[PDB]
């Protein structure tokens, strides 16, 4: 099984996440809270190791005011645990989980089973599927997506997310190396597409909130 | 003296224009006769060479009912005249207008005269500031532009585009080579990006539209 999925993200109107050089400050102030918010809510937040490097992000809840067992467990798609060691995500906060393949360096692996559970999963690349019922099975019902553009389509046509919620910012970067929301290989086919349906749509400080069920 | 310039897209959630094999079926039919509806009340509508090529577009009003002098100019950027003679674009529909730049060969240049206006500008790629200057004066005060994305970028970071109007279909369909609403060489900062204002928003068919102006 699995947890319910909720993608979170921020863009730029032209669908960036982040420009070339992994400039990404997006969100209006509201924003940040309606995140925060919504971390209160779920079990367990969930982002790759691209993201952790880029921005070593606390990934928990302090934008909002939050009870001692409100932060969610913190989770890291981390095929070769690079998660540096010092890095925010490992503090004290809230309990991490680093998902890691099976080449994973024994040593790294080791150093971060001492202030993370380790997950192995997959040969190579990590196994979503595995890790997300690894973390089912620790009693995660509800997880929050938060990027990055590679991790989102994995999850996406790996049929993994329930939810799409995006800010759009009202600003335009360009940029044909920018993050896009969703990166990777990519569906040929317009006809391919992953399917939505619009469910809210709202203004919130200056942003644009739309939020979306992935139809089945 | 310029045209007021509305860009006009469509793109899936994620950003996207076209998949990286050239697909690009995005709008709903509502979207489809509110663009041809929008033309209508424009002067002009331009798009870049490479469009041209990738989808023999007529750029002329036929989704809904129209009359003769309905049919705007029709305007290519073709920095190297490599719009093809038997294009529709260069069709009787409609007057075309090509813009080249002094470097394209001369041979294409006097083919395309042939069919179109041709208006030179720019030593080695299309000056867009003069080209519009010199669009003015064939009575051309209203313009919409159809991208593609990088034309797109160099509009908007000439500060050429006074609005901005995209159908947001509800699919994802990834790809870090898709091209997205703007690509061209990018902005580096999101504190440099250039900055909309929400008109108003609403949904149309199957479809989120949106319309901003451009602040700068
Ligand atoms: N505004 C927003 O909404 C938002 C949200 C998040 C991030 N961002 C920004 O956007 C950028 C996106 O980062 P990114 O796309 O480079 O990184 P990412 O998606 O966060 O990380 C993806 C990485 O995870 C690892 N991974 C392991 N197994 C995987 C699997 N099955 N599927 C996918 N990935 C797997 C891979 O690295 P290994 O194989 O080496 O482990 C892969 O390259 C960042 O700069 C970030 O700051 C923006
Ligand atoms: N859904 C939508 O809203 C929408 C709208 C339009 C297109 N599309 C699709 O999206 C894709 C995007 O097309 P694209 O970005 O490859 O092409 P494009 O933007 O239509 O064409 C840009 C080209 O115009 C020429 N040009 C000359 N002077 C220029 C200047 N100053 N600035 C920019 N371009 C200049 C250049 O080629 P030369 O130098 O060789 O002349 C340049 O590569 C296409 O596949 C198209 O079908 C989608
Ligand atoms: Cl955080
Ligand atoms: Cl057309
Ligand atoms: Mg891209």
């Known amino acids: 099984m699995r947890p319910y999925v909720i993608l979170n993200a921020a863009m730029t109107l032209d669908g960036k996440i982040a420009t070339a050089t992994g400039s990404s400050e997006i969100s209006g102030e509201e924003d940040l809270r309606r995140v925060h918010e919504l971390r209160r809510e779920c079990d ?7 993201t952790v ?6 990934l928990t809840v302090h934008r909002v005011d ?7 467990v913190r ?12 890095f925010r995500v490992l503090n004290d906060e809230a309990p991490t989980v680093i998902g ?3 080449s994973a360096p024994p040593e790294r692996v080791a150093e971060l089973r001492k202030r993370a559970e380790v997950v192995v999963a997959g040969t190579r690349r990590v196994d979503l599927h595995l890790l997300l019922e690894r973390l089912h099975g620790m009693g995660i019902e509800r997880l ?19 939810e799409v919620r995006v800010c759009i910012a009202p600003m335009i970067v ?5 993050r896009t929301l969703v990166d990777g290989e990519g569906i040929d086919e317009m006809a391919d597409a992953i399917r939505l349906e619009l469910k809210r749509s709202y203004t919130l400080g200056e942003d644009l909130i739309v939020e979306y069920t992935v139809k089945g």
Request: charged content about 20%; overall charge negative.
């Open 44 to 50: 367990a937040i969930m982002v790759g190791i691209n």
């Open 53 to 58: 490097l880029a921005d070593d992000p606390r």
């Open 66 to 72: 939050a009870a001692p067992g409100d932060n969610p």
């Open 75 to 86: 989770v890291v798609v981390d095929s070769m645990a690079r998660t540096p060691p010092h």
């Open 100 to 102: 890691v393949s099976e």
């Open 144 to 162: 929050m997506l938060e990027g990055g553009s590679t991790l989102n389509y994995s999850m996406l046509t790996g049929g993994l997310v329930d």
């Open 174 to 178: 360009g940029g044909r190396d920018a």
